[PDB]
Amino acid sequence: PPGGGEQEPPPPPAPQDVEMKEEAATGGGSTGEADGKTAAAAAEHSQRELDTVTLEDIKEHVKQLEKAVSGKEPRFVLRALRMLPSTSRRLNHYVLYKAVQGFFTSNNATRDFLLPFLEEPMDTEADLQFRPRTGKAASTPLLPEVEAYLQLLVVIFMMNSKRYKEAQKISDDLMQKISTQNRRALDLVAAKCYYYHARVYEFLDKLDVVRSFLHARLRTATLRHDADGQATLLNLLLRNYLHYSLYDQAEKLVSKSVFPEQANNNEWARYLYYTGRIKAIQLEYSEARRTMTNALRKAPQHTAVGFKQTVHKLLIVVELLLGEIPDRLQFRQPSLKRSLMPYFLLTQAVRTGNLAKFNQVLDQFGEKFQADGTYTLIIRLRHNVIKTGVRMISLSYSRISLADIAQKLQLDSPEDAEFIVAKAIRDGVIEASINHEKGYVQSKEMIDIYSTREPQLAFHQRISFCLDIHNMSVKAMRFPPKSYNKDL
Amino acid sequence: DLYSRYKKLQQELEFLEVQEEYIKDEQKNLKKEFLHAQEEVKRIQSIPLVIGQF
Amino acid sequence: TDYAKKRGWVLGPNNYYSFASQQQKPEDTTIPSTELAKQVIEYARQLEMIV
Amino acid sequence: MSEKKQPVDLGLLEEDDEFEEFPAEDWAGLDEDEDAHVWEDNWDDDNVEDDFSNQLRAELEKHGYKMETS
């Protein structure tokens, strides 16, 4: 009784100041920032709100707060209500209601007052004037707080929060398309909503509702968008298409439209991993290699570690198809290390390529990579072994023996040697000379680079493409200084 | 007012439009003038001269 | 039978012959010098358009 | 979003809950020889090492016997 009883009212009185100061700082900062001209100043709170969201993703917020700390839940915004002029007595009220809970105690509870959150959104959310931005700035931050701990029958409470979200703003909207900074906020805000109860969705249900409406809301923007939030709404569609769609006459190349200015400094990376994951099933060797390795190298801001094990793991999964498999070399973090701790014996078992042993080795300790689903690219790997090994033979000498290298490829016949080597010949990835003088098969095996071999035409295209990248980077150092000198 | 704001505003679109090629003309001409006065104050600096001491 | 009318190649003395294989004469370098000149035009453009 | 990092990290906590500090200490048996040694070299050394961990690891002791026999 004295241990936690003496340290009980101590620890708590500490996130109160930073959360109230935070909601007054970004609330009064957002309203007090874009209040006069919201249409002139745009997206200044874009990075602010998302950095507060990623700042509160690692909240250790509620650990003990089920027991008599729940006074923060019935309290809310309460700024300048019931009359748009004459808010001075409400400036008194701001200190008053915060001071009422600070005299002795408060009658508090957790799960009772959830459903009448629409009492103020019926008449006045904040002021009767800035109702959209104050409505979303009021409701949308506090809904992941109470609808955190998605488990333990808060899924139904999440459904209540869903129908409240749609019911006040995103059933259609209050004015269809706000066409301001909170329209541009409401894109990724409504998206973030749909990601947040997308766990509720895939938890028991599947694709069959708001996702089907999200094409209509995806095109209700009119098209005149920059389509950043439209792309974020596309990302939940494509992640919904990851687990089971497999049809390619719509999303593959059909969904592929204008390719708008879709940046976010995250959405290139995760959008590109998503389209590389779905473009990874046809075994893309040129494109998804470089650009999916690029999407690995993007998003450095928060972590380069915890998520890029997936684009990394899939990346090396499709890299060992080509015969040349680079391991984890330049990045040191013990998350990808434990990620490849099962994968290491088999990815080193790629290059030597011993059939009967490594066939037993894969399924032998195969637990999670073969429990990862349907054995597809490993079942292509199982006969890609001799193709990458014979590609190492292509990196070795020319003539093919009937005992030495045929026995070495575990493949002992005159027919299958030239036959499957010829299956490497019909690829075109190699250079070989099919000749029979006595029956032995030659190859010129010329891996001579273009150094003194048509160089002008060769790095011709390198000059044009590289100068276009460097010179559009010159555009990228022209225009943001215009975005510097614009205000002054 | 409300529907007149469109066609009233279109004239402001055109008047802000006309500043584009104008600022192109200034930005192309005054740097040529800058190398005019730059080369002209350069050719003041001629090599026959007297040497003093500081 | 079918491949003599499908391929339409030369059928030699008990051998299968391969022609038109890496026979190509390289370019004159003149037309790619013209498109490189167009690249120089577009370098004067992209380097100096807004100026 | 970076909130889809959360179920992937729940998968990571299941991976760390597979073996609890059995691979950190046992693989730290190799890391204590491998810590602060540049791991780009440990991929080449791990490459030819794991290549010859099966057979003919040292093998330079055998080449003197390969002289008269080959």
Curated annotation (Swiss-Prot), chain A:
Regions of compositional bias (Pro residues) in chain numbering: 1-15
Q: Tell me, which GO biological process terms does this entry list?
A: proteasome-mediated ubiquitin-dependent protein catabolic process; regulation of protein catabolic process; ubiquitin-dependent protein catabolic process
Q: State if Phosphoprotein is listed as a keyword.
A: yes
Annotated Pfam families: PCI (PF01399), Rpn3_C (PF08375)
The molecular function terms of the Gene Ontology recorded here are:
enzyme regulator activity
Residues with the Phosphoserine modification: S401, S413
Report domain PCI positions. Answer: 269-448
Q: Does the keyword Ribonucleoprotein apply?
A: no
The protein's superkingdom reads: Eukaryota
Q: Which PANTHER family match?
A: 26S PROTEASOME NON-ATPASE REGULATORY SUBUNIT 3 (PTHR10758:SF2), 26S PROTEASOME NON-ATPASE REGULATORY SUBUNIT 3/COP9 SIGNALOSOME COMPLEX SUBUNIT 3 (PTHR10758)
Please describe what this protein does.
Component of the 26S proteasome, a multiprotein complex involved in the ATP-dependent degradation of ubiquitinated proteins. This complex plays a key role in the maintenance of protein homeostasis by removing misfolded or damaged proteins, which could impair cellular functions, and by removing proteins whose functions are no longer required. Therefore, the proteasome participates in numerous cellular processes, including cell cycle progression, apoptosis, or DNA damage repair.
* The name this protein goes by in its record: 26S proteasome non-ATPase regulatory subunit 3
Q: Which species does the entry assign this protein to?
A: Homo sapiens (Human)
UniProtKB/Swiss-Prot annotation, chain B:
Q: Where in the cell is it found?
A: Cytoplasm; Nucleus
| SUBUNIT field | Component of the 19S proteasome regulatory particle complex. The 26S proteasome consists of a 20S core particle (CP) and two 19S regulatory subunits (RP). The regulatory particle is made of a lid composed of 9 subunits, a base containing 6 ATPases including PSMC4 and few additional components. Interacts with NR1I3. Interacts with PAAF1. Interacts with TRIM5. Interacts with ZFAND1.
Q: Which family does it belong to?
A: Belongs to the AAA ATPase family.
What does the UniProt record say this protein does?
Component of the 26S proteasome, a multiprotein complex involved in the ATP-dependent degradation of ubiquitinated proteins. This complex plays a key role in the maintenance of protein homeostasis by removing misfolded or damaged proteins, which could impair cellular functions, and by removing proteins whose functions are no longer required. Therefore, the proteasome participates in numerous cellular processes, including cell cycle progression, apoptosis, or DNA damage repair.
Q: What is this protein called?
A: 26S proteasome regulatory subunit 6B
Q: Which organism is it from?
A: Homo sapiens
Q: Which gene encodes it?
A: PSMC4
Tell me the stretch of the parent sequence this chain holds.
39 to 92 of 418
From Swiss-Prot, chain C:
Q: What does this protein do?
A: Component of the 26S proteasome, a multiprotein complex involved in the ATP-dependent degradation of ubiquitinated proteins. This complex plays a key role in the maintenance of protein homeostasis by removing misfolded or damaged proteins, which could impair cellular functions, and by removing proteins whose functions are no longer required. Therefore, the proteasome participates in numerous cellular processes, including cell cycle progression, apoptosis, or DNA damage repair.
Q: Family membership, please give it.
A: Belongs to the proteasome subunit S14 family.
Q: How does it assemble?
A: Component of the 19S proteasome regulatory particle complex. The 26S proteasome consists of a 20S core particle (CP) and two 19S regulatory subunits (RP). The regulatory particle is made of a lid composed of 9 subunits including PSMD8, a base containing 6 ATPases and few additional components. Interacts with DDI2. Interacts with TASOR.
Q: What is this protein called?
A: 26S proteasome non-ATPase regulatory subunit 8
Q: Which organism is it from?
A: Homo sapiens (Human)
What range of the intact protein is shown?
300 to 350 of 350
Swiss-Prot record, chain D:
Subcellular location per the Swiss-Prot or TrEMBL entry? Nucleus
Instruction: Report the sequence similarity comment from the record.
Output: Belongs to the DSS1/SEM1 family.
Which InterPro entries does the entry link to?
Answer: DSS1_SEM1
Which GO terms of type biological process are on file? double-strand break repair via homologous recombination; mRNA export from nucleus; proteasome assembly; proteasome-mediated ubiquitin-dependent protein catabolic process
- Tissue-wise expression: Expressed in limb bud, craniofacial primordia and skin.
> Where mainly located?
nucleus
Name listed for the protein in its UniProt record:
26S proteasome complex subunit SEM1
Q: Which species is this UniProt entry from?
A: Homo sapiens (Human)
Q: Keywords assigned by UniProt?
A: Nucleus, Proteasome
Q: What does this protein do?
A: Component of the 26S proteasome, a multiprotein complex involved in the ATP-dependent degradation of ubiquitinated proteins. This complex plays a key role in the maintenance of protein homeostasis by removing misfolded or damaged proteins, which could impair cellular functions, and by removing proteins whose functions are no longer required. Therefore, the proteasome participates in numerous cellular processes, including cell cycle progression, apoptosis, or DNA damage repair.
An annotated GO cellular component: integrator complex
Return the Pfam families for the record: DSS1_SEM1 (PF05160)
